[PDB]
Design an enzyme around this catalytic site. Structure first.
Site, PDB file in Angstrom:
ATOM      1  N   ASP A 121       5.339   1.984  -0.253  1.00  0.00           N
ATOM      2  CA  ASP A 121       4.459   1.074   0.015  1.00  0.00           C
ATOM      3  C   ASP A 121       5.233   0.206   0.933  1.00  0.00           C
ATOM      4  OD1 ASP A 121       2.408  -0.726   0.262  1.00  0.00           O
ATOM      5  OD2 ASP A 121       2.882  -1.570  -1.866  1.00  0.00           O
ATOM      6  N   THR A 159      -2.798  -1.931   1.616  1.00  0.00           N
ATOM      7  CA  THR A 159      -2.233  -0.715   0.730  1.00  0.00           C
ATOM      8  C   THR A 159      -3.438  -0.049   0.235  1.00  0.00           C
ATOM      9  OG1 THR A 159      -0.476  -2.278  -0.051  1.00  0.00           O
ATOM     10  CG2 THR A 159      -0.757  -0.672  -1.348  1.00  0.00           C
ATOM     11  N   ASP A 308       2.369   3.637   3.541  1.00  0.00           N
ATOM     12  CA  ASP A 308       0.898   3.514   3.881  1.00  0.00           C
ATOM     13  C   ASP A 308       0.926   2.403   4.832  1.00  0.00           C
ATOM     14  OD1 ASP A 308       2.367   1.445   2.304  1.00  0.00           O
ATOM     15  OD2 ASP A 308       0.746   1.168   0.660  1.00  0.00           O
TER      16      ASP A 308
HETATM   17 ZN   LIG Z   1       1.935  -5.555   0.916  1.00  0.00          ZN
END
Ligand SMILES: [Zn+2]
Ligand SMILES: *[C@@H]1O[C@H](CO)[C@@H](O[C@@H]2O[C@H](CO)[C@@H](O[C@@H]3O[C@H](CO[C@H]4O[C@H](CO)[C@@H](O)[C@H](O[C@H]5O[C@H](CO)[C@@H](O)[C@H](O)[C@@H]5O[C@H]5O[C@H](CO)[C@@H](O)[C@H](O)[C@@H]5O)[C@@H]4O)[C@@H](O)[C@H](O[C@H]4O[C@H](CO)[C@@H](O)[C@H](O)[C@@H]4O[C@H]4O[C@H](CO)[C@@H](O)[C@H](O)[C@@H]4O)[C@@H]3O)[C@H](O)[C@H]2NC(C)=O)[C@H](O)[C@H]1NC(C)=O
Ligand SMILES: C=C(C(=O)C[C@@H](C)[C@H]1CC[C@@]2(C)[C@@H]3CC[C@H]4[C@H](C(=O)O)[C@H](O)C[C@H](O)[C@@]45C[C@@]35CC[C@]12C)C(C)C
Ligand SMILES: [Ca+2]
Ligand code: NA
Ligand code: NA
Length: 806
Positions: A121, A159, A308
């Site tokens: 992430d 996200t 992402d």
């Molecule tokens: Zn974030």
């Protein structure tokens, strides 16, 4: 309710999620507050930590231990990942030289190489290079496998939209996860990071990879992990599932890391505190790869290391406040931060008017750090409009900034130094891709591509037929050693007519005039040849676009340009011409200023008319082939044909004329000639797809001349610019735009200045992929090149972004 009275004995990290109120033992049970009472005890052991030590080698199995260092541990599948290093004198995977994986080297009973998705992430693209020193496992994957310099996320660069785009190959507008926060007016429900609504299946559209796999008899790991399960346990659980018998073993796995995003928000993308998070992620990759080496799977599994979105510098003090612009601030709801979405606070307030809001947010302050749009006017490349969860009014926020409703929202609701969410072409939003394994290539760099493409490739890697999605299957074939997808060109649906001279001048009652009356077998045979297509191989370099729906159209040949003229829409679908590096720009001559000439090839009833434009006080017209670029005074007459005319607002004509008079020639000078294809687009329902004739909302007053929503141009040249565009031996280079056809230039705050200070900036914002133009027109370009079709598919998904180097 959950009768958490059952037991996770023999069930730890079960793959099949069991139904209420029976307690669960799967990697998501904590998130659903649903785990059996003994799940922590039996499934999340921590004793003695995550690494074998010398003193633990050959130990007696103690089932209480997090992982094992006993002799039985390899058959059991539960060694610590460093076991062979500590106890058996083996090397760490990172310390081994890389050697090409020419074929899968898998244990007996493996029916296909597994796929492991390692998703991180907030992993900004520039971390690969800027952090390479502290990431040796990652660096080995990158340099030994296939990597891109970066990967483009979808807008908004948050996200949930991006993680669900990865899993489905769909745009957010199509999968329905359009932000981290949403309101669906049809369900009258709200979706938030914190809360129970997000667990409801109704939000999540399309078909994610795990459902695609399952439905086709390919077993999937469970992709997602409750936040409290430590990364070491996630890794050990993957390694365990890989040791399951053949009939139970999944074929695809995902690991997810909350880092570096979590630290990035607190510290900025490059805050000194960001080093430790990158070290920690690399250690995790090292544990996976040592564990794979232990199981003899490290030359068998395909590994995708993928982010992402990236992370930008964003502080509290860089906030715009809507309360500084609007008198009526309490009458609206804003979804704030790195993008803005505005709607009415109350459906019962009929004094709410989007026009007055848009106006009050338009170019009001010198350095205003956001720009309002109705959603249909957003750049088409964003594909961010066709969902009732996307509000009509959108604020595109400048990188480094936030928008908020009122100051109290920001100090009474600073901490943070990083954020993301901005326009997906912003360099700081870019993320990573690395593919490593028997199916990927060896030490290969591939150009940047978009995360929408990955779903297809993961389907390819697994032998699955992908669900309908927004990738372009084949455009990433060059990442792969094997398992390529060999698509075929769509069949053309409509074939063109080739009309000769069929009408006399006096049959036309179009209200047009032209001083063309001023008038030889030398050149008369020559210009008849031009009308038959004698110069077509110069101006139509990649063949004619194929028409992929049923319609009635004519190919028209001229000295300087070729076109496919729609009898339904009364204008070209496409106009194709080549401008060499040495071409000259001329003016529209005086006697031709207001010239429009009937086209003797095309009936009156299938033509536009000048009267309609005289009587429409808002609408003017332009030309698709630019008169400024005629090859000769005589050839210039062709550019004033009624069949080269398109309706254009005067505001838009300023943009178009500057493009045609100045930029085209400039591109030809810089690229060693260019081939241009231009045309109209009609997308009144903003779904990204060509409108049928019955979907057009606006016509030139009193006529059946439909008004385009947008104008495109596809500008192609030789990648090797020492070859002229018309005599190019190898790969192509393209850039394209889709300009919104708007009656004002409100989008451009600087538009009262000379076009040289704002037109190109507008065009860069509305940069596009050829594939975007294809969806919007139902045309298929580049049908006849010397190039492989996969290579042309890559070219078609190329986006020229104008961002400086990553
Ligand atoms: Zn974030
Ligand atoms: C990116 O990739 C995707 C996938 O390839 C492309 O999207 C597809 O576009 C198709 C054309 O727009 C579309 O086809 C329609 O499907 C309708 C049935 O769809 C349901 O079933 C499918 C299949 O399982 C499912 O995936 C759908 O899921 C959608 O809807 C729910 C809504 O709650 C969401 O959860 C989900 O996220 C998804 O939403 C998205 O799509 C819908 C449109 O379906 C949007 O409205 C949303 O905003 C969101 O973007 C569905 O559950 C089908 O009913 C349609 O058929 C009508 O129209 C055709 C036109 O040919 C006509 O011939 C038919 O007769 C019919 O007309 C009738 O209904 C009309 C309207 O009610 C009415 O006017 C008429 O009078 C008739 O009565 C249509 O065929 C396909 O569903 C989507 N798929 C997906 C996954 O989104 C997308 O275009 C690509 N983007 C680009 C730029 O290329
Ligand atoms: C609709 C379907 C779904 O599977 C729906 C499915 C896609 C949805 C339902 C539950 C869901 C919203 C989770 C919420 C908890 C969150 C975790 C946590 O906060 O503890 C973690 O921190 C990160 C992460 O954002 C996370 C795991 C997810 C992500 C997406 C999930 C799995 C069909 C297609 C099967
Ligand atoms: Ca449309
Ligand atoms: Na007019
Ligand atoms: Na302006």
């Amino acid at each position: 309710w959950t009768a958490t009275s059952g037991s996770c004995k023999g069930r730890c990290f079960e793959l099949q999620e069991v139904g209420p109120p029976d307690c669960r033992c799967d990697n998501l049970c904590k998130s659903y507050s649903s785990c059996c009472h003994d799940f922590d005890e039996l499934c999340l052991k921590t004793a003695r930590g995550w690494e074998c030590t010398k003193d633990r080698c050959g130990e007696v199995r103690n089932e209480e231990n997090a992982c094992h260092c006993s002799e039985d541990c390899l058959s059991r599948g539960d060694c610590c990942t460093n076991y062979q290093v500590v106890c058996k004198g083996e090397s760490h995977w990172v310390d081994d030289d890389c050697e090409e994986i020419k074929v899968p080297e898998c244990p007996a009973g493996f029916v296909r190489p597994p796929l492991i998705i390692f998703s991180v992430d907030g992993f900004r693209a520039s971390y690969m290079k800027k952090g390479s020193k502290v990431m040796p496992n990652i660096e080995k994957l990158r340099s030994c496998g296939t990597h891109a310099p970066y990967m483009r996320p979808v807008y908004p660069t948050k996200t949930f939209p991006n993680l669900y785009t990865l899993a489905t190959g769909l745009y957010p507008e199509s999968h329905g996860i359009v932000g981290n926060s949403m309101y669906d007016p049809v369900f009258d429900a709200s979706f938030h990071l914190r809360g129970r609504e997000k667990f409801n299946h109704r939000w999540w559209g399309g078909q994610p990879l795990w459902i695609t796999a399952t439905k086709q008899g390919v077993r999937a790991g469970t992709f997602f992990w409750s936040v409290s399960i430590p990364h070491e346990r996630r890794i050990l659980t993957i390694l365990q599932w890989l040791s399951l018998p053949d009939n139970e073993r999944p074929s695809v796995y995902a690991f997810y890391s909350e880092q570096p995003d979590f630290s990035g928000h607190k510290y900025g993308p490059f805050g000194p505190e960001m080093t430790n998070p990158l070290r920690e992620i690399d250690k995790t990759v090292g544990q996976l790869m040592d564990g794979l080496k232990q199981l003899r799977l490290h030359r068998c599994v395909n590994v995708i290391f993928v982010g992402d979105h990236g992370m930008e510098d964003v502080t509290c003090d860089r906030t715009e406040f809507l309360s500084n612009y609007l008198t009526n601030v309490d009458d609206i709801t804003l979804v704030p931060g790195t993008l803005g979405r505005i709607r009415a606070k109350s459906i019962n307030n009929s004094k709410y008017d989007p026009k007055t809001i848009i106006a009050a947010l338009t170019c009001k302050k010198p350095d205003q750090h956001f720009k309002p749009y109705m959603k249909q006017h957003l750049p088409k490349r964003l594909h961010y409009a066709n969902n009732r969860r996307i509000e009509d009014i959108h604020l595109l926020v400048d990188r480094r900034w936030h928008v908020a409703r009122k100051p109290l929202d920001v100090y009474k609701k600073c901490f943070f130094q990083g954020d993301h969410g901005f326009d997906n072409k912003v360099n700081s939003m870019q993320t990573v891709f690395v593919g490593y394994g028997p199916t990927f290539k060896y030490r290969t760099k591939v150009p940047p591509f978009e995360n929408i493409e990955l779903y297809n490739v993961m389907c390819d890697l697994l032998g699955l037929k992908p669900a309908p999605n927004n990738g372009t299957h084949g455009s990433l074939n060059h990442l792969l050693r094997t398992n390529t997808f060999r698509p075929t060109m769509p069949d053309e649906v409509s074939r063109p007519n080739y009309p000769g001279i069929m009408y006399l001048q006096s049959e036309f009652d179009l209200g047009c005039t032209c001083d063309d009356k001023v008038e030889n077998k030398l050149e008369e045979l020559n210009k008849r040849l031009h009308t038959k297509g004698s110069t077509k191989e110069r101006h139509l370099l990649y063949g004619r676009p194929a028409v992929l729906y049923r319609t009635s159209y004519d190919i028209l040949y001229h000295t300087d340009f070729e076109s496919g003229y729609s009898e339904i829409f009364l204008m070209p679908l496409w106009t194709s011409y080549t401008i060499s590096k040495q071409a000259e720009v001329s003016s529209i001559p005086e006697h031709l200023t207001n010239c429009v000439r009937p086209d003797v090839r095309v009936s009156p009833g299938f033509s536009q008319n000048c009267l309609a434009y005289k009587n429409d006080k808002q609408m003017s017209y332009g030309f698709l082939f630019p008169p400024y670029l005629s090859s000769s005074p005589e050839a210039k007459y062709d550019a004033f044909l009624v069949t080269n005319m398109v309706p254009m607002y005067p505001a838009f004509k300023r943009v178009w004329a500057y493009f045609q008079r100045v930029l085209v020639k400039k591109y030809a000078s810089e690229r060693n000639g260019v081939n241009v294809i231009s045309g109209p687009i009609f997308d009144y329902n903003y779904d990204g797809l060509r409108d049928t004739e019955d979907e057009i909302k606006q016509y030139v007053e009193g006529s059946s001349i439909p008004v385009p929503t947008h104008y495109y141009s596809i500008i192609t040249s030789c990648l090797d610019f020492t070859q002229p565009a018309d005599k190019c031996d190898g790969p192509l280079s393209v850039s394209s735009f889709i300009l919104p056809h708007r009656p004002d230039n409100d989008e451009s705050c600087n538009s009262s200045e000379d076009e040289s200070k704002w037109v190109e900036e507008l065009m860069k914002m509305h940069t596009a992929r050829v594939r975007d133009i294809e969806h919007l027109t139902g045309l298929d370009f580049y049908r006849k090149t010397s190039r492989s079709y996969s290579e042309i598919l890559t070219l078609k998904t190329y986006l020229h972004t104008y961002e400086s180097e990553i």
